[model samples]
Target chain A: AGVMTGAKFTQIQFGMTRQQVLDIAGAENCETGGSFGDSIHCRGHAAGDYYAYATFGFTSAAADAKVDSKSQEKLLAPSAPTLTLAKFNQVTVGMTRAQVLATVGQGSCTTWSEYYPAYPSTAGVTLSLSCFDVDGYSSTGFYRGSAHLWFTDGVLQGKRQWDLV
Target chain B: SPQPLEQIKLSESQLSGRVGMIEMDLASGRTLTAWRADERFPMMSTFKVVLCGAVLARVDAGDEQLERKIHYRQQDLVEYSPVSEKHLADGMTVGELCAAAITMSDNSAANLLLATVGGPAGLTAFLRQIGDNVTRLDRWETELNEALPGDARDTTTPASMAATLRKLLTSQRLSARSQRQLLQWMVDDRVAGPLIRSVLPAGWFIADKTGAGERGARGIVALLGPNNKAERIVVIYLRDTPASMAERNQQIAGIGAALIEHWQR
Candidate 1:
């Protein structure tokens, strides 16, 4: 559970109960949130080098917010993508949103806010989660992996490998 | 469109648990759809709204003032006391405490407010005063939320919760100022943080309090409407499930979606 990466990531699959994920993840290396976008609940871990995320998108036709997606990644050398490794290091917490794009070269980033539950009646209590999919070419064709950049108040607070390099 | 009752039942079956729901027209006091309405489920944090309502009732009666500050030590905190834990140095006002309990779902804040409102017994008395005989608060949170199977110590039925919420928000039981404050606090729910407001549908708005406990106990009581008008009350609860929190929430969202889809009815 202590900030999972690599092989343990493979053991997780779609549609597993959260407790099962916690069981595999052990303790302390996890964070839980009630709802994000079309997904109803989420559990994940984010550290500097790696990040493991689970989106429990559900069954209903309207939203489908349940046990739908789970993914994890850790930084690696560009035997996978050398340039990606170079760009990734340039991205650091506290950087502005545009600053991140300049370094990572801008990929498709799905932006959503981790608002405090009491959003409308309150103000300024929010965290944003987004995709920093470092889209580029590898030795072969194209390599696709995401570096999840967590932003609070539009500033990067954390970054984790969406998957390996 | 699908029937919300049947659809909510689908959510339960998928989770291998029971889902109870009640959707009512707040202004009219009409029950539009109900399933397992009498079935009891842990009120969890959902009770906090009522707790605050009791506090406001007292305030309006001149028994308490919102400006009075509460002081406590770090040792006073239970789990999930984010705001209260930080305010140990400077005691928070009663108003501030209520705000944290409602908006952030702060456990320690809730406990402190629970004590101020005369503990669980006094809050239950408030419910009885307001005519909600079915709703009860026998224990404080952390313990109340233990949610052990078949434990009715601190649980309420979907219909009963919806009734109490409607009474608190619209029944004139509390002063108009108190009612407005309570509604706004729910609207400011910091915990409903990260809601997909887009997924909720065009012209609709949500103000809610959500709760979760062990044995897969989870629930939400919300004021939902279109054009941002508080037209209806939606209360849903889940228990006896082995599913993940995400799955339970999705199921609730699914039910809510169906209700909107069938809103024309």
Candidate 2:
């Protein structure tokens, strides 16, 4: 029986056998695959020898976490959602309806059923749109529930609903 | 309706060492008693319960078969686990292996089932499908299989294990009969003495399993708290403790006795 070599373990850990790597990069690439590749492109090696080499170094740490071969590759070339931060507390009064819509997503009529308290004080030249009720209400036709935007003196005060129903 | 919680008196001196207790009302889903319930620890065999669901799910969905037998290779036999080293090397049906793995904490059985069931990858997939992010089975088994000192094994927070146990007891995924079958095996288990069974009234029933390994001890306390309408699950795990096995068992038994005494009203 052939004894399993550390190379085999490394191959399994990296999810590509030595032969597979050689097949893609050719036997020449394997001779230099460890460190001697500068953006070398192997036909059918979308992640190329350099990519696999970089992965091998990083995979040492990956072994500690027990991350498998396929997942480690995915992590190295993840196409998942980028970690984009969203702006919070970003509404102001005196903004036009379009500005309010731009700041927050377009409000659905179903969100307008609840009452929108007047800004600062009632009848204070504040234009308040109805917000949704926490008690839960019907989601009727357009503008069925309540409006979510509140404006005071042509300026946007803030949004009435933190999240959509 | 909020049910009044019962109380059990315990002298600080009577309790030999530090003890943690937690209880939840099944009907109201309210926690009646808790101490460090959010603490994290290696989940041990309690992981098997989740693995069982994962296996059963595939079997029920026709992705696998309960009767499918898998050979238990010698390498799969986990050292330091007597149950695994002895009875598990022979080829066994998936169902028998799972039952022994859970009820007896048969280490090799768990490894085979886990391997056939997707090992760490498959287990993670199942947990993700159930919307469970807190439980991670990073290793093939436990820390006993560690290659070096200070190697971290598969672990879960008490909160995550509690949620996982609750999902199992509530049959959130498996059929009711399968759930009962699994629970029956767990309750009938003899391994972790007095952790869960000690709390039950002689005739009153309990379905639970215990997990204890080098430097770790944990168990789930399941019963219908207050009104017996909904079943509540309480998980407790202690890691890196200097407490002896006897002291740990006493603490576990005391907590169970106290919770059962206080919550059964």
Candidate 3:
């Protein structure tokens, strides 16, 4: 825990530079390949003895320096749903967009194509073509696995997923 | 241990994963072994080979030049792009990118070249143009390595990948210089340089690209032989197993040991 706090975390916005995030959050503990292209996972300030975490994607402006989306989270909070081989098995190719949504659920889905949380669009984002990345966070807050679903004509024809935290 | 299948079956039990492999004579297309050769596996960093081939194809056509420096900023950097992350300022030449990509399996370097080749779809088209319909790349670096179970995206069959590698390296489809350049890149591989070569007996050579991480998969597509001459193309892929990466790599070495035991000249 350093510069970024619960309120300061709110001050963290997309389109900021990696340096700016560094100045605000103290220092990025990890720079990840990231769920959204390139990103920095920073250790935010502690709150009532509890540390905070938040991840920001660099897709906001410059390919290198700008902030894209700010959604880094400290793992001490409510746990995200876990990603497991058993749950992953429930998802399969040939499923429709809705079918995949029903099985995999929604909100947790992420797309490498952009920085924003925009995914599984109603027709535009579900945008009739292309591949997207959907990562699932484990109960401990670390990403457990990822699914890169390839959609051609609104069906999951190809998928590349990995569940190694 | 005398039989390839013997070691393969043993490794399958030990690693608890489906193993796909092919051993082919580079000259005659004579396949010595075909365990799950027809099965599809993630291309992983192995596609960097084809990526450079396509780039060289452009260079051969004068549409591209290796010495041309391509520039990008810091945010463009992707995961595992060790060499690329180092050269963010002046940028790297197309040739240097190829080196970073093949020699070290740099993901950002591959993505840079992937864009030049029109991303994954374009690379797939290049494969199709070369008469390889079985191998397809539908995603870019890192994403392509997801290696989802039974998913066809970004995957290739050992038979098809080996054939394409042979064609790229020896089919004369690429200009001899371009072919040589690609081969040297593989030969210069820092990713698999010494340890992989250690598995082979004395006087043998190997040029390969390997991909590893998460459940995405661990795999290699390589050329092996003696005295810097390739005798065979070995493509091995493993997926769906939760085994430790170390154990999985040992399985590959185990396979190579058995092949050396039986196939030595």
Candidate 4:
């Protein structure tokens, strides 16, 4: 059996059955628990790799249920070499600020003392990049849209995009 | 008949960005416009009010529950959200999420509600069902990178937003119970910014949702009236403000104050 490398870990999706996970990267010691006949919690080491832990969840009972793979690979994979719309889609919650910077090169970073009223005590910073330019217009203020990566306490917490008017 | 109010000059020099405003007398169903009321503008966080309406509509139809618990996963966390920062681990009820989204402009709560009611496409469908053709929700929160330059980011015209508020207030679309609940959330909003609330006269209460972005977009959709009546629905959407944020906020307050004076007099 092959060990569960970072490559294999990324493939594990939510709602995948315990057996399905085993099929991907052989069986190993795993702790399982959940309530509400509709939930499952599973965590364990990949076949030969006991150091790195892989965790996943299921919406319903794990007995022959389907998996939730929406962007699972992107969520677990290390930051990409370059950030694009496709890579941007893969960015998920729980990513560290450094990981995000590595994926999308530092474009325009700005820090605001008063980001939003809700989080008044916390400071916020953003990394913005002009990913694409307008197709037909030559002089419409440079870029057509902007990708914004938001951070707080050195963690990538939010992201968004906007079309420049 | 559309009884136009006295022309109140909202100076552009006071604002760093363009502005559009429309005020409607809910009792008379008349529109009083300043300028660009029909023009589209980025809704910023103000769109969350629409999202709230859509979710409440679903709840009215027996599709969801206000008390249902939505587990908050790590993936649900977003920056600039105090609600998510506090409840990320323990999660929150749908009703609480709605309050956070409207009152504090919580991004993660908005996204969660957006997902619950169905994504952007679902919101578009809900708007169409309600006869609003001007508003569009093209993408999710903070995920606008995939949208093309030509694609309409979540946007709404002052006329459209005001009309929607009118419907919500009249309980024309949602149930009376749901409408009351939604209004209560807005009324309890603590972070409504300086626009609608700053210029209100004594005894006048405003229930509103505000939206702001880094690109100089600020606006509010509100229901304003005396202590016991909701007589007017105001929609102000601004973008491309070149002035400092403080100045922009003051400009918005000025607009609101001007409108209050016109209607009250």
Candidate 5:
């Protein structure tokens, strides 16, 4: 899946760029809603929270991928979605497909082809992002649904699913 | 064309000597030429026939399916006087079990199948339903004729067991399919020494089962005669004979062959 941050977005895991984060939160045209007892509640805060990585829990495989039991805390930010990577309590859908794959390895299958359109107008200006094709998994064998990543433009979407077993 | 009872004197001999029981069946349902058919002799494996009737009863009542499979557990295997130990592998269908129990006289197979079809009590119930009062199937593990005072063991009475077979063959107790299956299996029994089959001609077909105990043995022969209408049922029980089991079987076959030849002529 894709990754998103409050201020900027980069390749994630490696390092995030500011513009990518702004693109995710729509910060320029948005405003902070207001203030609370201890924290200020603003439109920017709402937008950032609405499109932040903390929404989706994330985890790292290298540190916690043990046989008996694995941890779900994301070593990287919660912006990306990884198949094998365990999920902590904080994660979001603002991450891109590359970020997810880099952290989660590869999907299970890709026998069937899938397509994705650019982010919709409601999400703001288009990033002119292009779709990246990955390897396809077979529709046969034990694990049924393990192939083909899904995405909307450069953003991480969902994966193609099917039944095999 | 009725032959005089005096002319129909059948003989009997022991294994090295001659020991036999002869009974004459008349139109009046009474025996004229007789020895000691009523004497309580060891039924040997003939008890298996009662087991057969019991299995058929279960099938008729839909309590057990003929095609159902019965597994032979370790406890089911048992040794007997003259019957084979086991006839098949781990398990067999009810139809096959019935066949093995009848034809080959597989004692273990018969007892195993009977237990699954419902034990002695179940068989007794069927016997009562058909009014067969002079029979009992003791536990499978015991000897065929061994009886204790008041113990539900030992089944006989030439007339009663014969009547049971007659009813089973001609009555409406069992379905057509069951009747045909029973007869076919009986005919397929490879244990036919000579008791009944020897009496019939080369091609004369007879569906019969035999039982032999310490000194006595019995044979039940069901025949489809010359005309489709000539359906014949015969039962022969003999004891205190010197004829070997093998020789006795041959005697049954000889009697069967002679009867068929007499009927044909």
Candidate 6:
């Protein structure tokens, strides 16, 4: 929902300027941190309640000049599906939010809105990814199973499963 | 004379895995051990302590400065990292990196420092120089997945890790300033909630590093004490924990509480 869609996420690429990312993803819930040359750390809402975190490297003059309009249009295309455990595991650390959505599909859970902080400091570095089970959709009964998927800086870190005895 | 030490019995059902532990009194040289303290276990983020030592060794030699900035690119970024989350354009200083590596268990920061001090080979050289020959620093933090199942990517025995902590506390290998810096960073670390710090009494201090991953490879190497008292170095390594993460944390806490009770008595 909103601008946090697969299409908008795909618009973000490594070496893009923070401004460019802001333009594509919208500035809603976005936070930025220290810069090294053209590199910058950023966090913001991605799909539904899930957040996106990323560090964009400096844009090279040649690479910056060679932007292909066709590629941009392709990235803006709409996509589908909902997040699942199998899809969640497919997401890996160091992948962009766009890549995560591309692999796992868009997230479906909407109960939790707060993003996990990336650092202990006030610079507002937040975890890039988090997962919640959809109440009715998730399995219940004798199994008593619950799964949590955690991601940071737009990459899948790991997941944990709980089966109450 | 009788030694001031007691045997610690840990529960297998509670631990849900294999565990190795040793608590040594630095002043008395008395010790308490469980399982095979000499057996090697996966060090995981716990090895970052030595990585810090290797970097600080360079600092002690005047070869590097705390203020020196290291440029990190997008490629240098690793997952499960908080330090790299903030800096994508510019890189952090050596001091900042060290702080994040120790206090937050930041993987990217550890890898950066590991590369700075000459990779795994450099860390091994430092370990050997400090009279620790058994601990192995084999791969970069990013390459942990490449390690074989049930095999440690990097490893150290409980004894070796405790000895290394002892060296950090008492050896001349690191300058006083460097030693203080390293210890303070460990003291400031907030990630030990599931390890020894979990059961530490209020007003007691613990300077420690913790590691956790699949197969229940979880542990902490700590310098523990009440303020103004001589401290003891404790190392606890657990593997193959068949329990949930919450239960494993509680089990470690239970072990810590029992050890503290024995020491206090």
Q: Is the docking of candidate 3 incorrect, acceptable, medium or high quality?
A: incorrect
Q: Model 4: per-residue lDDT, tens digit, A58-142? A: 4335477554311111112222223456556666656886676545544322221112222222344222222221231111111
TM-score, every prediction:
0.63, 0.53, 0.64, 0.62, 0.50, 0.64
Q: Which should have the higher DockQ, number 1 or number 6?
A: 6
> For all candidates listed, what's the TM-score of chain B alone?
0.96, 0.81, 0.96, 0.91, 0.76, 0.91
lDDT string for model 5 (A12-116, tens) is: 121223333234535443222111111111121111001111211011223231111001101122222233313211113456755645544443211111111
Pairs of colliding residues, candidate 6? A36-B89, A36-B90, A39-B89, A40-B89, A118-A125
Best by DockQ: 6
Question: iRMSD per model?
Answer: 15.4, 25.6, 13.5, 16.7, 37.3, 12.4
Question: Which of the CAPRI classes, incorrect, acceptable, medium or high, describes model 6?
Answer: incorrect
| Displacement of the residue B213 alpha carbon in candidate 3, Å | 4.0
A1-165: candidate 2 lDDT, tens digit per residue: 122222332343333343453444344423322111111111111110001221111112222322112211101111121111131235455677567555544432121111112322334343434333222122110111222455545456655332233
Give one digit per residue, the lDDT tens place, for model 6 in A16-134: 55567667766672343322233333343221001233434332323352111111101121122255566655756666656755665465322111132322232332232333334
Report RMSD (Å) for each prediction in the order shown. Answer: 17.1, 23.5, 11.4, 15.6, 31.7, 11.7
The alpha-carbon deviation from the true structure for residue B92 of candidate 4, after best TM-score superposition, in angstroms, is 1.4
lDDT tens readout by residue for model 4, B30-114: 8865568877787777788788899888898898899999996654554334454345435788888888888867677888998
User: In model 2, what lDDT does residue B173 have?
Assistant: 82
Task: Give all candidates' CA lDDT scores.
Answer: 0.67, 0.48, 0.68, 0.60, 0.44, 0.60
List residue ranges in candidate 5 displaced over 4 A: A1-165, B1-10, B13-37, B80-89, B145-153, B216-221, B227-230
Each model's backbone clash number: 23, 13, 13, 8, 66, 5
